[PDB]
UniProtKB/Swiss-Prot annotation, chains A, B:
Activity regulation, free text: Inhibited by pyridone-containing alpha-ketoamides compounds 13a and 13b. In turn, alpha-ketoamide 13b (tert-butyl (1-((S)-1-(((S)-4-(benzylamino)-3,4-dioxo-1-((S)-2-oxopyrrolidin-3-yl)butan-2-yl)amino)-3-cyclopropyl-1-oxopropan-2-yl)-2-oxo-1,2-dihydropyridin-3-yl)carbamate) inhibits SARS-CoV-2 replication in human lung cells. Inhibited ex vivo by michael acceptor inhibitor N3. Inhibited ex vivo by compound 11a and 11b.
Numbered residues of crosslink Glycyl lysine isopeptide (Lys-Gly) (interchain with G-Cter in ubiquitin): 5, 90
Domain of life: Viruses
Protein name in the entry: 3C-like proteinase nsp5
Provenance organism: Severe acute respiratory syndrome coronavirus 2 (2019-nCoV)
Reported effect, residue 132 to H: In strain: Omicron/BA.1, Omicron/BA.2, Omicron/BA.2.12.1, Omicron/BA.2.75, Omicron/BA.4, Omicron/BA.5, Omicron/BQ.1.1, Omicron/XBB.1.5, Omicron/EG.5.1
Reported impact of residue 90 to R: In strain: Beta/B.1.351
Annotated phenotype, changing residue 189 to A: Does not affect ability to cleave and inactivate human TRMT1
Compartments, as annotated in UniProt: Host cytoplasm; Host Golgi apparatus; Host nucleus
Residues on Cytoplasmic side: 1-300
Chemical reaction(s) catalysed: TSAVLQ-|-SGFRK-NH2 and SGVTFQ-|-GKFKK the two peptides corresponding to the two self-cleavage sites of the SARS 3C-like proteinase are the two most reactive peptide substrates. The enzyme exhibits a strong preference for substrates containing Gln at P1 position and Leu at P2 position
Subunit structure: 3CL-PRO exists as monomer and homodimer. Only the homodimer shows catalytic activity. Interacts with host FBXO22; this interaction promotes the proteasomal degradation of nsp5.
Domain Peptidase C30 as annotated: residue spans: 1-300
Length: 300, 300
């Protein structure tokens, strides 16, 4: 059978999205309790973005210059402050739809759902991974400024990301909900280079286990490998090194399928060295690395 | 840049999902106003599914044999009836979260979002296409019985699909919300054959336009084709025939990119005949056919 890339249900986040407008600049904000969070470059014009002095810019703004709209309801801003690269707008009404929530900072290679919004209204939802170089792949709408990334754990929304910028290379960069960028990026118009983007090895192995569970078995072999010998091949193909901690979290999938982790590593080594020879895995001609081991377990 | 497969925001549907249990059988139901809709084989045991007489089975059931749970709230069933392959359970409480909604029957090749649920609780959301042979691809969880497919138009949820069965080939079949199956399938354990699954040509062309909009241009050529000559090649590669109506709905994308539809058809012909020669489009080594022309316009 197949195995779809699923996002988390977005309902708890939809009720928090708002439109924030300062002059000609409009983007998305997050309304939790009596605070609206949004990227601080809402206070910039296109021509300010080369070398903005955000504190000086923020001083020239008054509360009435921030127009916040929740659906077709205008909120009254009563204060404004800046935490790192996030603007916090104080409003006179607590969001009655505020879910239970946390702010978390995630690690490269972990996954999350994004609710893509256009001028405050939810448009779509997708699942993605933080690349090892701290970028996010997607289109302009996919990364529309102020849209947030999140995971759901039982009853609690864990907010981990907010889109801020599209780099000149067409990939996206953003912050945690405390305003700290992921990666070496800044909210200015500067040619900003990202590091080498590697493939998330442990996620590829998780997906190969998902393939076996769903009946795909042609890539299995009777070969063996050590961890060091695998990592020598991985490095040649721009795959991240596999650690013993990664081996440990694949344990549940190894137990379910009866394939030892290092045996699946021997299968991956052969796929990297020889390709697929015109065959597919789970309907894909490429190895997929946006499923974590935990994602696969939740869905298998 | 990239171009993600986005689902619709699921919040309006999450509030309608419930758990329905008859004895040892549990699945998902849809709670709209004072009616719960679910697959009628909830009243069957595993051993009844070979040749069930659904009317006789339904007669032996009493209202108290249907246990409906909305989250951790048990609903009181006060009536039960059957419309085609859908069971309708009358409850004493209208769902206060009932959205504005319609029931629609969709065409092969059209797309919709699925809210995958496990025993009444939303698990994930994904976007998919109705295959030309009226099956849906996905995993067991992806097609968990009673989960529904939908589109959102402005303020209204258009429900178009409900998962009922997994065919022995690992693909899914289901009904519209009036209980009529898509395709030649029935809710029994019978080896049931699906027709030939073809590629949705107009969707592939829409995705090639999305690729050009996002900077991928290597597959464009200075060749031309007629519609008949293209369709001769399409048929060889199990692509659906392209109609003039399909050409018409690609018009907006042709206008935006400056590439006439038949010129993009000449590009597709070359890709089918020669492959990609180790190159990718929008990060894919295969041609993708789960974006309609309308999907691409909404996101580009």
């Amino acid at each position: 059978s197949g195995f779809r890339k699923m996002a988390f249900p977005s309902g708890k986040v939809e009720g928090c999205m708002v439109q924030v407008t300062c002059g000609t600049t409009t983007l998305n904000g997050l309304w939790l309790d009596d605070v609206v969070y949004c990227p601080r470059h809402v206070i910039c014009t296109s021509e300010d973005m080369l070398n903005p002095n955000y504190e000086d810019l923020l001083i020239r703004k008054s509360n009435h210059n921030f127009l916040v709209q929740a659906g077709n309801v205008q909120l009254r801003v009563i204060g404004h402050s800046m935490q790192n690269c996030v603007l916090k707008l104080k409003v006179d009404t607590a969001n009655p739809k505020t879910p239970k929530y946390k702010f978390v900072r995630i690690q490269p290679g972990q996954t999350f759902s994004v609710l893509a919004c256009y001028n405050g209204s939810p448009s779509g939802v997708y699942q993605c991974a933080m690349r090892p170089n701290f970028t996010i792949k997607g289109s302009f709408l996919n990364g529309s400024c102020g849209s947030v990334g999140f995971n759901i754990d039982y009853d609690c929304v864990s907010f981990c990301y907010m889109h801020h910028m599209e780099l000149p290379t067409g990939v996206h960069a953003g912050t945690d909900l405390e305003g700290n960028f992921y990666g070496p990026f800044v909210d200015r118009q500067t040619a900003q280079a990202a590091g080498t983007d590697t493939t998330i090895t442990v996620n590829v192995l998780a997906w190969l286990y998902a393939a076996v569970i769903n009946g795909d078995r042609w890539f299995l072999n009777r070969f063996t490998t050590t961890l060091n010998d695998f990592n020598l091949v991985a490095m040649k193909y721009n795959y991240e090194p596999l650690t013993q901690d990664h081996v440990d979290i694949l344990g549940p999938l190894s137990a379910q399928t009866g394939i030892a982790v290092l045996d699946m590593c021997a299968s991956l080594k052969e796929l990297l060295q020889n390709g697929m020879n015109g065959r597919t895995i789970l309907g894909s001609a490429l190895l997929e690395d946006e499923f974590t081991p935990f994602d696969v377990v939740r869905q298998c």
